[PDB]
Amino acid sequence: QVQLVESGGGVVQPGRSLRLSCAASGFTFSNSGMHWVRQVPGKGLEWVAIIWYDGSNKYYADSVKGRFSVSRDNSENTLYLQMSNLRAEDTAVYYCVRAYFDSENLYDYYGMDVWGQGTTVTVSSASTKGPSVFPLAPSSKSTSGGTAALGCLVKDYFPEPVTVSWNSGALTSGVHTFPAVLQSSGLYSLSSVVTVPSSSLGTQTYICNVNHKPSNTKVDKKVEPKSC
Amino acid sequence: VDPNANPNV
Amino acid sequence: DIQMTQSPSTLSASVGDRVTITCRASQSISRWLAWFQKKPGKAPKLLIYTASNLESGVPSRFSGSGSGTEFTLTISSLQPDDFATYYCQQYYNYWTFGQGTKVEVKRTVAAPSVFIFPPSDEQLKSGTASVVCLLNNFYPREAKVQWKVDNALQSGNSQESVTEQDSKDSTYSLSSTLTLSKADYEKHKVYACEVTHQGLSSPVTKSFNRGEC
């Protein structure tokens, strides 16, 4: 039952600071070295920092050296990562990772074993904004045989995430809510498309529900067919 | 101290 | 300064297939190599440590070998739980990971269904025009979507998003969003996306004219 739970993730503007925490349970936190690993969107996994069991030794990756500080509080079973002078490239999912621990610890060089589920840190000068939901209207251009496509464009929201729900009763061959894309404005955007029977386009009602909790926005939009 | 050496007790 | 390279980048396989993925190091790391498994939305899990030793609870179908610069991870019989991404990690000089290797579900080539959506009038009233091109249920994932405005190939004004592989039909779905200003949208009349895929004998073009809808 070795369990590592990250906390403190969220939005932080560039040049500012944020501290992450990691709650350790199921093992002796005081007896284990700990790691921080991050995965920048698109880029692969990269090691951030390591701290010794007693806090006496700390090493960092060159990309975060001089801006990031790793700490621990063995009396509270908590690991810390103080991030300062944050840049957009520091936007990533940060994982709390335990160093390799064995009872017959006769090893020379040590890696990592148990990871936490991770927390997301979004570094941007953008402000919290609810999305604008626009209809992707069905038409002959979005119909192929007995299957038609329609959807909703969820545009210009920050931060992540949003939840797009389609109404029950919308006969659906498949719902594809695409991963978000970061636009040049620093705002996110996604589409949620659904395949429906072409027979029901002139009768069935199709409504998408977009809920953006950070802005407390819950918007429903009906997608109506066009003559095209 | 080698950063890859044993970081545990 | 130890780089880890993995081949292949994407591996297509089926249930029961013997799967082998290779990891190379820029220098000799002896056996100080580890293999991790990460399924989407879930945290990485350590499968193999010291190049070849299996971790506790890891199924015996997983196997690892190598010493020095070249390493391999082998799954003798591929199970449904084994479809994920695998990373190798060296722990000799700091900790660096490979770019990852995704094990996807092999299936027959499936051509994409191409749909195009014109901008809504509500979005045009906000001063921006987004045209969306949908590629639905296709395989393999490699697909080329090109935007043409008045038969002029567009660069820099589109962004694409692809879904993960759906367990139902082992297919992918892709969207391409062309974003223009209302001033530029009304300058031109013809809008089209061209899709090039292995399941298509010729590039498929769906188009629409501003004002027809």
Author numbering:
A (entry chain H): 1 to 52, 52A, 53 to 82, 82A, 82B, 82C, 83 to 100, 100A, ...
B (entry chain P): 2 to 10
C (entry chain L): 1 to 94, 96 to 214
Copy text verbatim from the article accompanying this structure deposition.
IGHV3-33-encoded antibodies are prevalent in the human humoral response against the Plasmodium falciparum circumsporozoite protein (PfCSP). As the most abundant surface protein expressed by Pf sporozoites and with essential roles in parasite development and invasion, Pf circumsporozoite protein (PfCSP) is a major target for biomedical interventions. PfCSP is composed of three domains: an N-terminal domain that undergoes proteolytic cleavage prior to hepatocyte invasion; a polymorphic, T cell epitope-containing C-terminal domain; and a conserved central region largely composed of consecutive major NANP repeat motifs. In total, 22 antibody fragment (Fab)-antigen complex structures were solved at 1.54- to 2.95-Å resolution to gain insights into whether differences in potency are associated with different features of PfCSP repeat recognition.
The 10 mAbs that exhibited high affinity for the major repeat and varying degrees of cross-reactivity induced two distinct conformations in the antigen. Comparison of the 1210- and MGG4-like binding modes revealed that the N-core conformation was largely dictated by the HCDR3. All seven 1210-like mAbs contained a bulky Lys or Tyr residue six positions from the end of the HCDR3 (termed here position HCDR3(-6)) that directly occluded the MGG4-like conformation through steric hindrance. The presence of an HCDR3(-6) Lys/Tyr appeared to correlate with IGHJ gene usage because all seven 1210-like mAbs were encoded by IGHJ6∗02, where Tyr is the GL-encoded HCDR3(-6) residue40. The remaining two 1210-like mAbs (Ky15.10 and Ky315) contained a Tyr at HCDR3(-6) that was only found to contribute HB interactions in Ky315. Ky15.10 and Ky315 had lower binding affinities to junctional peptides KQPA and NPDP compared with the five 1210-like mAbs with an HCDR3(-6) Lys residue. This suggests that the Lys residue facilitates high-affinity binding to junctional epitopes where DPNA is present in the N-core, which aligns with the register by which the 1210-like mAbs bind KQPA and NPDP. Despite the shared PfCSP recognition mode, the binding affinity profiles of the seven 1210-like mAbs were distinct, particularly for the KQPA (1.13 × 10−8 to 3.13 × 10−7 M) and NPDP peptides (3.14 × 10−11 to 8.14 × 10−9 M). We observed that these differences in affinity were associated with the specific aa situated in the HCDR3(-6) position.
